Design an enzyme around this catalytic site. Sequence first.
Site, short mmCIF file in Angstrom:
data_model
loop_
_atom_site.label_atom_id
_atom_site.label_comp_id
_atom_site.label_asym_id
_atom_site.label_seq_id
_atom_site.Cartn_x
_atom_site.Cartn_y
_atom_site.Cartn_z
N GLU A 120 -21.83 14.51 7.59
CA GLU A 120 -22.69 13.93 6.56
C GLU A 120 -22.71 12.41 6.64
O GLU A 120 -23.77 11.78 6.53
CB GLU A 120 -22.22 14.33 5.16
CG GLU A 120 -22.52 15.76 4.76
CD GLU A 120 -23.99 16.10 4.81
OE1 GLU A 120 -24.80 15.32 4.26
OE2 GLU A 120 -24.36 17.13 5.40
N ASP A 177 -38.70 11.48 -0.46
CA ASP A 177 -39.04 11.87 -1.82
C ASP A 177 -38.58 10.85 -2.86
O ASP A 177 -38.67 11.14 -4.06
CB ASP A 177 -38.48 13.27 -2.13
CG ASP A 177 -36.98 13.30 -2.22
OD1 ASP A 177 -36.34 12.24 -2.11
OD2 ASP A 177 -36.43 14.41 -2.42
N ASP A 214 -29.25 9.58 -0.69
CA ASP A 214 -27.97 10.27 -0.58
C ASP A 214 -26.87 9.23 -0.46
O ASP A 214 -27.00 8.28 0.31
CB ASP A 214 -27.92 11.15 0.66
CG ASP A 214 -29.05 12.13 0.73
OD1 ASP A 214 -29.43 12.68 -0.31
OD2 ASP A 214 -29.56 12.34 1.85
N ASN A 231 -26.99 13.65 -3.45
CA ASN A 231 -28.36 13.23 -3.71
C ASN A 231 -28.64 12.75 -5.14
O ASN A 231 -28.18 13.36 -6.12
CB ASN A 231 -29.29 14.40 -3.40
CG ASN A 231 -30.74 14.02 -3.46
OD1 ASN A 231 -31.41 14.31 -4.44
ND2 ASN A 231 -31.23 13.34 -2.42
N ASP A 265 -19.27 28.31 -6.53
CA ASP A 265 -18.82 29.61 -6.05
C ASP A 265 -18.61 29.54 -4.55
O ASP A 265 -18.71 28.46 -3.94
CB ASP A 265 -19.78 30.73 -6.48
CG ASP A 265 -21.18 30.59 -5.87
OD1 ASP A 265 -21.33 30.04 -4.76
OD2 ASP A 265 -22.13 31.06 -6.54
#
Lengths: 157, 129
Positions: B35, B48, B52, B59, B101
């Site tokens: 990343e 958009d 980040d 984001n 999760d």
Amino acid sequence: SDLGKKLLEAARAGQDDEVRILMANGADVNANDEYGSTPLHLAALMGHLEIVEVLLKNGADVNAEDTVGDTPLHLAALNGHLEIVEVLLKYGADVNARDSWGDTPLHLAAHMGHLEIVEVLLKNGADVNAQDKFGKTAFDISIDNGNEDLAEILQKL
Amino acid sequence: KVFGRCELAAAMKRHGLDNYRGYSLGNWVCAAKFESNFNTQATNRNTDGSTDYGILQINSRWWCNDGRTPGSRNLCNIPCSALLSSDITASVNCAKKIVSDGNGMNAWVAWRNRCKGTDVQAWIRGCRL
């Protein structure tokens, strides 16, 4: 399209026999997924040596770049797959390829402490003084992680 | 701050990511390398209008507030600047909110494409943890 998607999946999953039948039935050896991975990227990433060789014998693009500029050699070197590193180099992989982050395979192997792969890359012409995006050489990376063995190799070079 | 691998593994262990939602520590270290290249100050502008931020490239439309992103949700309830700290605490806490999760690391496309299914143990090996 259809068969290329299945080939990508079989290469990632290590399904050697499915790779074989898909190639026999006309799958595109250089199919791309959304990430820009080819089957060779995925077999190299996941350590599937036999699939790597099958793909290469069918004309896989040994220097294909994904969406972030990583080649199959980058992924194999990072993931410690010594034999795959050797076959990729044998088929013309660029030992000094830079990905979009500015890492060479030597940087990636050094990050992970993959001693045998570092030695293979150096033997094949890796630039031992190549600096990453933050000015670090493989030696600096090894010092960062306190890897005495790896540092001992690179210090004298 | 640019971490090294073992330094980051130790910090992520300190902040309780080992086995978080069942994901072993090496998953998070691997994700950070792809990343941000281990850089806490990494930023990436998106078409958009969001950005980040930080070591896990979190984001600004969905997760943190940077004050310049249309449609801000700020689900981590944090200023994005907190995600640029040399201290990874805020990034870890927001990552913990993103991963609710055992499939939550799919939040990182690079983790899905480059870390999932690999030998994640290697990312924490040799680190004297």
